[PDB]
Amino acid sequence: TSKKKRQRGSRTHGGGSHKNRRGAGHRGGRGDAGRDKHEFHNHEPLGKSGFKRPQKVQEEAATIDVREIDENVTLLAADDVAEFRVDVRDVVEEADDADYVKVLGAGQVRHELTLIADDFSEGAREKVEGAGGSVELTDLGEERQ
Amino acid sequence: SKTNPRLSSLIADLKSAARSSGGAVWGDVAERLEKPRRTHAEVNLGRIERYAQEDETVVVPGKVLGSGVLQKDVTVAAVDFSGTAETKIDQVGEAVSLEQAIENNPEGSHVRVIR
């Protein structure tokens, strides 16, 4: 039995005095009315902030942490097995509609990896080089100058 | 109120074991299972690897999921395991149902609760 089902006989259906559930006055105006007067509370403040760059001049990178690559190396037997070698462009999903692929450095690298991607972070390099291995930048990744 | 008949049976079996045999774990797991689904455990493998030890059964009062690596030879007991979780555990250890754990260990000894 729901709350709605127990209302017959209550007269007011939980609204208090029968003088309550009338029009928009009970809401203090229609919709977001008085967002700066009587109902200013918990509203985002009035005003403009910043600018937006045109959508076609906006680049969207496909990100992946070293932790995701490293945890799934034995499962990724469909890729190259070196002295492991993996092209990141084939691992990340939605890499078609993305502008470039970037490897970020969150987590640990327990294996020796040779990663090929368009961009790498300072911490993505340190973790792959420090755990014995190389980082190969693509021909598309030759933008850093 | 639960709607699954199998979960209702598991809870009743966990209770029967905690009252009959010398255990407090199965009654503790039963109390968490009687609680809402949102409170139940959603444990990944990287957590069982960090806090579990060998020859000590891991009891999850919820469901085990497949994120992360498990190297330890542990017997994991849960209400359910994901397809990948059960596959990844059986490679290095053993994924056991909580219904089996009650028959194999009714006293609930040498057991670690992980959430």
Partner: protein, 246 residues
């Protein structure tokens, strides 16, 4: 497990391995959900005329004549919900979504579980079916699909001690209530489901309470009518095999 195959005379003609899906744990709540969805999804949209009771220029006289402020036309009250011939306040609306959604996995698990409930002799007898067997489902040879006559299927089911179920369903109930005026006067118990492989059994379809189906499309409803698991079913050797990868 093992399932005994029967020829058109009702004699044992070998046996094949009963597939893995028949060992799926019976889950009546999930089966009931899949049937509740199927029954709701075939329901038609309805609703009263959006303008019923609003086709009048009726006005209230207001204060002054010792009468309630009710809209009147030619000294007769109109429009308002409390008035005879007035609009229906909160009527059935056509815009209402009367369909229920179900996840493919949750629905597929229900089909598997309903199929599994068919393999338990006690559940089948608990559902209501009348039979004299231990082994269930009844597994018959592929030469069943070639039968043309209905009376020939009667003889086979009598030889299989499974005809007593059609005698249960050979009693129509004249329902209580106004469903009668809408074409829903009768109803009868659900008996045997016949699952074939190529075409549904034209020979078995007219049997009292019987339902015919094919293994590529046999659903939760024909497998568990009204959400009640454990229907007395007969499979074709090839149907048993095709219903394995569902």
């Amino acid at each position: 497990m093992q399932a005994t195959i029967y020829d058109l005379d009702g004699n044992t003609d070998g046996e094949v391995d009963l597939p893995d899906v028949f060992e799926t744990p019976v889950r009546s709540d999930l089966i009931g959900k899949a049937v509740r969805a199927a029954q709701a999804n075939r329901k038609q949209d309805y609703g009263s005329d959006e303008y019923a009771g609003l086709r009048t220029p009726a006005e209230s006289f207001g204060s002054g004549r010792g009468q309630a402020h009710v809209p009147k036309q030619d000294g007769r009250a109109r429009r308002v919900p409390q008035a005879v011939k007035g609009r229906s306040a909160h009527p059935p609306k056509t815009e209402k979504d009367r369909s229920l959604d179900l996840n493919d996995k949750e629905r597929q698990l229900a089909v598997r579980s309903a199929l599994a409930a068919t393999a338990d002799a006690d559940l089948v007898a608990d559902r209501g079916h009348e039979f004299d067997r231990d082994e269930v489902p009844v597994v018959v040879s592929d030469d069943f699909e070639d039968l043309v006559k209905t009376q020939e299927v009667v003889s086979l089911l009598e030889a299989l001690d499974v005809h007593a179920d059609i005698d249960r369903a050979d009693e129509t109930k004249i329902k209580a209530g106004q469903g009668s005026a809408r074409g829903r006067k009768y109803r009868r118990p659900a008996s045997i489901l016949f699952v074939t492989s190529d075409e549904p059994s034209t020979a078995a379809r007219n049997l009292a309470g019987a339902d015919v189906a094919t293994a590529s499309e046999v659903n939760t409803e024909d497998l568990a009518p009204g959400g009640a698991p454990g229907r007395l079913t007969v499979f074709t050797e090839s149907a048993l095999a095709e219903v394995a990868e569902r």
